[PDB]
Amino acid sequence: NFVKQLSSNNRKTRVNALEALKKYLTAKQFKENKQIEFNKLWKGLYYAMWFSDRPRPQQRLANELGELHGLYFDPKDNSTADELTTNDKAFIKFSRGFWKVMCFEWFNIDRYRLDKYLLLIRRVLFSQLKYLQSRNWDKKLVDEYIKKVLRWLPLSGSPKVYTGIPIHIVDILLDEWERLLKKTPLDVIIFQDIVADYNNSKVLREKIKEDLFSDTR
Amino acid sequence: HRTAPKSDNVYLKLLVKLYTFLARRTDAPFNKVVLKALFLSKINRPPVSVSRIARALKQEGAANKTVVVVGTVTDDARIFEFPKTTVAALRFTAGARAKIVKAGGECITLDQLAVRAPKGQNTLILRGPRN
Amino acid sequence: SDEIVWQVINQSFCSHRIKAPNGQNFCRNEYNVTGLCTRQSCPLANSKYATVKCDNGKLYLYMKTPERAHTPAKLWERIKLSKNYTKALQQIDEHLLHWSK
Amino acid sequence: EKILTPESQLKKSKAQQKTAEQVAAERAARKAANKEKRAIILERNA
Amino acid sequence: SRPQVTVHSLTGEATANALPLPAVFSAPIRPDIVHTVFTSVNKNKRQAYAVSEKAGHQTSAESWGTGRAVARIPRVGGGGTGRSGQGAFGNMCRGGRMFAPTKTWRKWNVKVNHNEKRYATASAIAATAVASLVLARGHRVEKIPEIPLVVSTDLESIQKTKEAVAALKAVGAHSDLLKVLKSKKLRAGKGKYRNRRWTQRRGPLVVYAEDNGIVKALRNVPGVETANVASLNLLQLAPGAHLGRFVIWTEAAFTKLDQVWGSETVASSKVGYTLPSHIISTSDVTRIINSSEIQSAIRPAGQATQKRTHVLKKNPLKNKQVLLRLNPYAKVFAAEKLGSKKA
RNA sequence: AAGCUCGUAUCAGUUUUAUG
RNA sequence: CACGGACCAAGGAGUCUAACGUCUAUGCGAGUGUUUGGGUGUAAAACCCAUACGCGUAAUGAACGAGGUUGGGGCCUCGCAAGAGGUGCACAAUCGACCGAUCCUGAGGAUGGAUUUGGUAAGAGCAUAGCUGUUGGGACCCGAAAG
């Protein structure tokens, strides 16, 4: 099992597990399984990242792990005029598993390892909004992706999800968006509904009002 | 005049420092109340039954308000229609934990509540009967 | 966790603790930088640690990270300081990038 | 490759800068208020 | 789940196998509970000691009473032997009955709740998985390949002591073994002549699922102790009410620990018992306090040390400098010489 | 000594005033 | 004023136990108490409990309805603040009801009147450990005519 190998203490085996998984990810006609397999794979990747601490190499591991999101059926099929090509669904499931694993293990990260996971989240969010279509210029797929994103991270209605991840997402949203290099489908600014709707964490509402909206961009 | 707790538990001491830090750096009365209650002895911290929590939930806007119990939550066999709510307490009995989880609710610790409500956002404090 | 370990070593008979007449607690651990058993000074209670040691005349920069907490055998990653005060200090500063003051 | 600053450190720096701007504004306001109050006290004493 | 622990062969080379955490090491660590349980358990191996009842009362004596200009303490009768006229029947008298003679029915054993004992044992076992905590216990675990240490099941089958000690040395336990046999010192005090002459530091602990000769093989080597997963004695686990003993586990023992101490999947392997639940989800407070959520809704801090203000009082009416700070009209008064104003 | 309700209008080895 | 003190080395006195309690901490919690014993054992050491047993869990039908108002540590809205509004644990007053019954009555004891009764309305106890109070045991130590 990849998850068992990805969490292996030995560094060589851990790296080889990811190297082999680079192909298992693109192994077609096998990602149709339920989201539980994606959740298990991302749980294994969580420990795989956990086993790296040094700044320079951990950044390399984080970026190569974030590239896994784009590894899924790179934008070479030219699936224009298709609501779902059966490949973007795999990417959506992968992102959902990533967010579920990160949300569940948010408080299991020590103080020193928190920066590593913040960097990993930043890299994953960069790979997202970079690989939906060729880039984030697809309404028919952004509506599905935003629906599967709006319902978990920015919900702010269920206190089960910690408010730190939404705060980091708010902080890095505009920073990462400018990296893509415009009139992009930015329905994303969800935050208006969060501010309008009560019952949410007042800290989150204040942070988004003071920082996100106040931004000149 | 209560300043510090007599309990030797390390986890209780960590919770006490967290609550003191929140109270001193937030000036929110909710944190002060819980910090003061943490120093109360076992007798002064009677358990709060799950039936008592369900009865307290009958007030308006209970779904949007979480319930916080300084003491320990004990199961009750006289009630079965337990609503879905988040309960935070130092300890949860096996029966009470099963009842809360079975009814779709979630049980969390004091630190989880503090991170979810640094200033007591929609937090309800229940005190068990003294005698 | 570090906090649990920190409490377990503050009280509860930490192995290396010297009760000086002045009341100061001195730590005899070789890896300690100050030699005192206090917070952010005891390597055992700190996941991240940095210290300077030397077997021969060469001086090394011993550092610890949470990565090797599961492998006590090779916890520390010593790096030679290329003995020279100015360049050694520059190398120490470069190595301890973004570390605590 | 270049080592990037910690995200927590970046947030701390941003918060420090934002608080320092307000601190400087408050210092300027306090200086102006002190000058005005000194003038008021001088006239009151006279 | 939680990370997995690899298995090291007798040669010391890591094996291409790993096992899931039994979840026992994730139990809360409560030094107070362990210390309280140990203080009562150590008293179990106590033998009753008392003074002879006939002591003191054997002597025959009577009180002379007033009129003799002497202490009214009872004195021995007779004569010629010298003992006559000597005081007796009193703790203040030589050879007399001691005040409050010790009696055999003193409370020796202490009853301890079974759940408290289980909690203490679980905490002691969990403390063994922390290298820093084990190091603070004084064990030389600085050169162990991994913690907790798990060895292949073939270790339990070793019969000769030489092979067992060689295997222990090969897995980084040589330092711990050498720690013993070097601290051997004569007993300090009156215990040298009460079958307590020699004392030594505790050695490594070896845990096995089943015994095939390892217990006899390691019996002779000083310091080293052997125990079964079922028992897991608290006294051996945490000698002197101290957490974090160096324990060398085995693959079979590691696998059987899940059953013995229970987990989320296996219910308890015991009658109506479950592992204790933490009252706090996170055992670390630095991450929580420094969390984004808390920091976002926290007022700005100070300088970490209050600046001294008005350390010394500057008395006006002198030192014009301070006088000009207050009453800014002082400059006008002095310049205009208003004090000597003329009608 | 512990608990709850709390900071007030709870009071005074004081004075005047008012009712007498 | 009275009783001790010629000087010095050692000894010398709120110590143990059974019962009933307050406070404190732990484990569980409407359940709790492994150790009278058996299994087991590196052997008075360490680990587990099939049935019993001590305590509590239900008053003098508890849903008339597991109760309505006034306050109430707290929470939310408005408000720069002052303050205003909505909701409120424990706990207090009030409105009251009830389990069983008084004080009478009078279809053998139903029905109807007059007062109130001690408490429920939605458990808090078990065992362990520390200072500590009372009683009996030589009882903080010696000494009182004696059968």
mmCIF file of C-alpha atoms in Angstrom, chain A residues 4-5 7-10 43 47 50-51 104-111 114 118 162-164 167-168 201 203-204 206-207, chain E residues 1-6 14 16-20 146 281-288 290-298:
data_model
loop_
_atom_site.group_PDB
_atom_site.id
_atom_site.type_symbol
_atom_site.label_atom_id
_atom_site.label_comp_id
_atom_site.label_asym_id
_atom_site.label_seq_id
_atom_site.Cartn_x
_atom_site.Cartn_y
_atom_site.Cartn_z
ATOM 1 C CA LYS A 4 2.008 2.450 4.402
ATOM 2 C CA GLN A 5 5.155 3.221 2.389
ATOM 3 C CA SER A 7 4.700 7.064 6.150
ATOM 4 C CA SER A 8 7.773 4.811 6.348
ATOM 5 C CA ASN A 9 10.457 6.190 8.651
ATOM 6 C CA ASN A 10 13.264 5.453 6.185
ATOM 7 C CA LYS A 43 -3.470 10.937 5.043
ATOM 8 C CA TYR A 47 2.844 11.924 7.286
ATOM 9 C CA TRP A 50 5.552 15.405 8.371
ATOM 10 C CA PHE A 51 8.818 13.474 7.969
ATOM 11 C CA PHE A 104 -8.725 16.719 10.688
ATOM 12 C CA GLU A 105 -4.997 16.967 11.515
ATOM 13 C CA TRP A 106 -4.855 20.744 12.030
ATOM 14 C CA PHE A 107 -4.324 20.447 15.799
ATOM 15 C CA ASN A 108 -2.048 17.389 15.509
ATOM 16 C CA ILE A 109 0.748 19.590 14.105
ATOM 17 C CA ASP A 110 3.354 20.812 16.577
ATOM 18 C CA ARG A 111 4.334 24.470 16.825
ATOM 19 C CA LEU A 114 3.094 24.449 11.588
ATOM 20 C CA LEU A 118 1.314 26.397 5.993
ATOM 21 C CA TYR A 162 -10.683 25.382 12.734
ATOM 22 C CA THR A 163 -10.647 29.074 11.838
ATOM 23 C CA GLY A 164 -6.870 29.140 11.338
ATOM 24 C CA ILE A 167 -7.459 32.867 8.023
ATOM 25 C CA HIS A 168 -4.403 31.571 6.165
ATOM 26 C CA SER A 201 -16.670 33.230 14.020
ATOM 27 C CA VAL A 203 -12.688 36.778 14.541
ATOM 28 C CA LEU A 204 -12.890 35.414 10.995
ATOM 29 C CA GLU A 206 -13.289 40.860 11.402
ATOM 30 C CA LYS A 207 -10.141 39.506 9.742
ATOM 31 C CA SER E 1 -3.991 6.945 12.751
ATOM 32 C CA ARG E 2 -0.485 7.505 14.142
ATOM 33 C CA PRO E 3 3.003 6.840 12.713
ATOM 34 C CA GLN E 4 4.439 3.313 12.606
ATOM 35 C CA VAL E 5 7.490 1.914 14.406
ATOM 36 C CA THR E 6 10.065 -0.098 12.470
ATOM 37 C CA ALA E 14 16.661 -1.859 10.375
ATOM 38 C CA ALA E 16 11.915 -3.652 5.999
ATOM 39 C CA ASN E 17 8.863 -3.897 8.244
ATOM 40 C CA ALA E 18 6.808 -1.536 10.391
ATOM 41 C CA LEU E 19 3.944 -1.819 12.862
ATOM 42 C CA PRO E 20 1.159 0.631 13.744
ATOM 43 C CA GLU E 146 14.459 4.395 17.213
ATOM 44 C CA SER E 281 -7.135 17.667 22.972
ATOM 45 C CA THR E 282 -3.671 19.225 22.552
ATOM 46 C CA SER E 283 -0.903 18.600 25.083
ATOM 47 C CA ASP E 284 1.021 21.690 23.897
ATOM 48 C CA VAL E 285 -0.025 25.262 24.674
ATOM 49 C CA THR E 286 2.533 27.201 22.598
ATOM 50 C CA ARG E 287 0.864 26.278 19.302
ATOM 51 C CA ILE E 288 -2.604 27.112 20.643
ATOM 52 C CA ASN E 290 0.433 31.335 18.905
ATOM 53 C CA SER E 291 -2.397 30.102 16.667
ATOM 54 C CA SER E 292 -3.745 32.407 13.973
ATOM 55 C CA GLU E 293 -7.251 32.441 15.461
ATOM 56 C CA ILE E 294 -6.164 33.502 18.954
ATOM 57 C CA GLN E 295 -3.539 35.949 17.690
ATOM 58 C CA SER E 296 -6.097 37.561 15.372
ATOM 59 C CA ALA E 297 -8.357 38.462 18.329
ATOM 60 C CA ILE E 298 -5.676 39.443 20.865
#
